[PDB]
């Protein structure tokens, strides 16, 4: 009687042969650590970002517009090298026409180059092999070509279509030939775009600026994006106030393949989301509403399964408790409910019950969505739940704010900032509330610190190592203060006995007792440490303990072993 109309933005059908226009190439630059992606970029763009980058690392995807001498417009994507960012690279592979695979000469094909190969191969993207560091001493293009032949990438030398251009990034050796290689492959793909239709696009990175609010870096797939359009991405929407370019410039129009910063989002889009333009505000809200309703339905269903099980267990406990206990009438059920009378079930509603089990409550706040996702994948990797428990209470974009402090304060959390800030006020506030805010610009420092945190909470490993052993000989009954005290006369054989240490009693191989002496006394003197061959009188605090003539006694001491994290992150 009421079926919800399906209204959501659907990516338009493929453009007609008539309106298809010459496009511009989008090129990802991928590969293993320190092989020179960013130095390539820098040299093309006449800029230095390899100098200014924090830690000399590329931690963020970025798009860059480059015009060449020939009039070639290329959009470059800079992908990070570390194993942590594998999510990012994947996204880069989806939005690209061409990839440039960078492999240094002195090293050759390695793990991240393999991963990159896999992403580009799975996304069905044309790839161009660029060997780097040919100005080096050990530079060997040939080795690299062989190792590439291993992974089913065929170089131009072997007849394969994959183009191999050896290049030195520092000296600018073959740069013209890589440029012309990309040019040729691009002219070969015959790339087309629809300028006239509405805007289909894709989100690179979404972050929050204090001045400009919510902002997204997005590469237009097709359509002209003009100021004042209405965009919809995933579960959130925007009207477009500014569309700006990375040097700060305000650009009035966006044409397909151009990277564009966008302003005016109501909520932050998930990085890697496809952007569809619509006709009005109310249309956009119809859409967002639909999508939310949909997700809530799916989640509701899974929840419905878990629930049904829980209440079927309860239902079974009820049927058991009722039928098994001999139904007659309900009042006689009340009376026959007295056959199982004492009911021992212990349940406490307090929140300090898990602290000794050593949970770790953790709040992540990163600079951009991509980064946050990276960190949460790293946390997904966590394999040891018997050791500690890694509990992510909250994650989000933007600098550390008052809400995050409070949140951490209730859960005894730790706030991990990443490429973000914490103002004075926030800091002193977390000082009052007993929260620690640890800020990190470098992702593996962050994960290190996570490990440090997990291990510091980890249960100290208790090891029992022996101190002394003494055999009982005679048993005495001594009267002191109107109390008969059993006294074990002992002869210390190997080792020594000390008063403060923990003791255990041994009967013919069995262990009878565990605990500490009440009185160790030797020849009318109380002596803390009896050496070897020394006779010592021993009175335990436990009166139930029987001392025979032939018993053995082992004095032991407990030393603490500090365990590190059982969790080793893959990266």
């Amino acid at each position: 009687d009421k079926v919800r109309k399906n209204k959501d933005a659907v990516r338009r059908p493929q453009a007609d042969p008539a309106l298809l226009t010459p496009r511009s190439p989008v090129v990802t630059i991928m590969g293993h650590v320190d092989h020179g992606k960013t130095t390539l970029l820098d040299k093309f763009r006449k800029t230095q970002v390899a100098a200014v980058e924090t830690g000399g690392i590329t931690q963020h995807i970025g798009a860059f517009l480059v015009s060449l001498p020939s009039g070639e417009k290329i959009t470059f994507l800079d992908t990070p090298g570390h194993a942590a960012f594998s999510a990012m690279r994947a996204r880069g592979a989806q939005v690209t026409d061409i990839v440039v695979l960078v492999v240094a000469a002195d090293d050759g094909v390695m793990k991240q180059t393999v991963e990159s190969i896999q992403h580009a191969k799975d996304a069905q993207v044309p790839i161009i092999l660029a060997v780097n560091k040919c100005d080096k001493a050990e530079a060997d293009p040939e080795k690299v070509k062989k190792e590439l032949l291993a992974y089913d990438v065929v170089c131009e030398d072997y007849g394969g279509d994959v183009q191999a251009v050896p290049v030195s990034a520092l000296t600018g050796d073959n740069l013209m030939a890589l440029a012309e290689a990309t040019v040729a492959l691009a002219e070969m793909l015959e790339l087309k775009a629809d300028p006239n239709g509405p805007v289909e696009g894709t989100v690179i990175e979404s972050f929050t600026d204090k001045g400009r609010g919510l902002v997204t870096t997005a590469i237009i797939q097709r359509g002209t994006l003009r100021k004042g359009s209405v965009l919809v991405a995933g579960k959130c929407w925007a009207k477009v106030r500014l569309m700006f370019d990375e040097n700060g410039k305000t650009i009035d129009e966006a044409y397909p393949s151009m990277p564009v910063g966008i302003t005016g989002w109501r909520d932050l889009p998930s990085a890697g989301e496809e952007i569809l333009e619509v006709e009005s505000e109310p249309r956009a809200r119809e859409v967002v509403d639909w999508r939310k309703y949909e997700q809530e339905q799916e989640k509701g269903q899974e929840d419905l399964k878990i629930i049904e099980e829980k209440r079927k267990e309860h239902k079974e406990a009820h049927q058991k408790a009722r039928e098994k206990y001999g139904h007659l009438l309900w009042k006689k059920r009340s009376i026959l409910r007295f056959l199982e009378r004492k009911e021992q079930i212990p349940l406490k509603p307090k929140e300090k019950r898990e602290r000794d089990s050593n949970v770790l409550s953790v709040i992540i706040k990163g600079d951009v969505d991509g980064s946050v996702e990276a960190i949460l994948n790293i946390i997904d990797t966590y394999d040891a739940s018997h050791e500690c428990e890694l509990e992510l209470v909250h994650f989000g974009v933007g600098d550390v704010s008052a809400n995050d402090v409070n949140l951490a304060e209730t859960f005894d959390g730790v706030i991990y900032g990443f490429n973000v800030n914490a103002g004075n006020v926030i800091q002193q506030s977390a000082a009052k509330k007993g929260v620690k805010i640890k800020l990190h610009k470098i992702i593996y420092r962050l994960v290190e610190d996570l490990q440090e945190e997990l291990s510091s909470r980890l249960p100290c490993a208790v090891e029992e190592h022996p101190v002394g052993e003494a055999s009982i000989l005679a048993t005495f009954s001594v009267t002191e203060g109107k109390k008969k005290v059993p006294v074990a006369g002992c002869r210390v054989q190997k080792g020594q006995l000390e008063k403060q240490k923990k003791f255990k009693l041994t009967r013919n191989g069995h262990v009878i007792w565990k605990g500490s002496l009440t009185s160790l006394k030797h020849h009318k003197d109380d002596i803390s440490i009896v050496k070897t061959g020394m006779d010592c009188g021993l009175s335990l605090d436990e009166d139930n303990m029987e001392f025979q003539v032939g018993d053995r006694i082992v004095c032991y001491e407990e030393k603490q072993i500090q365990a590190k994290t059982s969790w080793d992150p893959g990266f």
Partner: protein, 69 residues
């Protein structure tokens, strides 16, 4: 309380005012874990002594009750 019995599902919440309080979850069945944010409202539950708040079903992390499937 005494005259009439069941076992009622409640949670403990911390509220934006910083005050921590027991609160009750309407409907049959629910999925709520620690760290979920909910929105609570003022109706007092008559059976439960002490429990003056109620989770709003259908907002944030408390979803509407799923019809039997």
């Amino acid at each position: 309380k005494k005259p009439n019995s069941a076992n009622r599902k409640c949670c403990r919440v911390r509220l934006s005012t910083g005050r921590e309080a027991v609160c009750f979850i309407p409907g049959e069945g629910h999925s709520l874990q620690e760290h979920h944010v909910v929105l609570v409202q003022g109706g007092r539950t008559q059976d439960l002594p002490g429990v003056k708040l109620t989770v709003v079903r259908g907002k944030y992390d408390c979803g509407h009750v799923q019809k039997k499937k």
